[PDB]
């Protein structure tokens, strides 16, 4: 999930967009 | 629609706090 | 009024920074 | 007034995210 | 204090209400 | 830079103004 993927290394905008509806 | 945008930002944080482990499904008007 | 409500949220964030160890008392 | 002021707080938050290591000049 | 309580582990809504006037 | 100064220890308001224009 997003916390596991994005809370140690920074997620780019593209990576964050994977979590949109 | 800027005011609705700013309000929505604060609503998302409120849901984050109140929903806790339940999470929430957020959709735009 | 929601606009005042949102303003107050920013005010308490700002007071937290400005007041430091003094703290602050916020009330409606 | 303060509406622009509060909006600006959200704008600098948004630019911080969007601009990445490029950064921004506010 | 509140930092030693609610910044060492996440406080529930009930624990946060401790700080209301 | 501001990260090494102000994320490893708290910067006072006066220390923060040194990064203004
Ligand atoms: Cl706002
Ligand atoms: Zn706001």
Give the distance (Å) from ligand 1 centre to CA of residue B3. 8
Q: Which chain A residues are Cβ-neighbours of D21 within 8 angstroms?
A: none
Which tokens sit at C23? 């703290």
DSSP, res E9: S
Residue numbers of F between 1 and 21 with CB closer than 8 Å to C: 12-13
User: What distance in Å separates the CA atoms of residue F3 and residue E14, rounded to the nearest whole number?
Assistant: 35
Q: Does B2 touch chain C (CB under 8 A)?
A: no
Cβ burial C1-28 (10 Å sphere, 16+ → b, else e): eeeeebeeeeeeeeeeeeeeeeeeeeee
Distance CA C7, CA E6 (A): 24
Burial class, B11, CB count within 10 angstroms (exposed 0-12 / middle 13-18 / buried 19+): middle
Method: X-ray
Contacts of A12 in chain D (CB under 8 A): 20
**CB-based contact C5:B3 (threshold 8 Å):** no
User: Is A touching F (3+ C-beta pairs, cut-off 8 A)?
Assistant: no
Q: In this structure, what DSSP letter does residue D20 have?
A: G
Name residues whose C-beta falls within 8 Å of residue D3's C-beta, 6 or more positions apart in sequence.
B3, C3
The tokens describing A6, both together, are 């994005």
**Cβ contact B26:B12 at 8 Å:** yes
CB contact under 8 A, D18 and A12: no
C-alpha–C-alpha distance, residues B17 and B19, integer Å = 6
Return the domain boundaries, chain C.
1-28
Nearest-ligand number for the alpha carbon of B4: 1
Neighbours of E8 (CB within 10 A): 8
């Amino acid at each position: 999930g997003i916390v596991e993927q994005c809370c140690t290394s920074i997620c780019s905008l593209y990576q964050l967009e994977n979590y949109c509806n | 629609f800027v005011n609705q945008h700013l309000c929505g930002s604060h609503l998302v944080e409120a849901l984050y706090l109140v929903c806790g482990e339940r999470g929430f499904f957020y959709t735009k008007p």
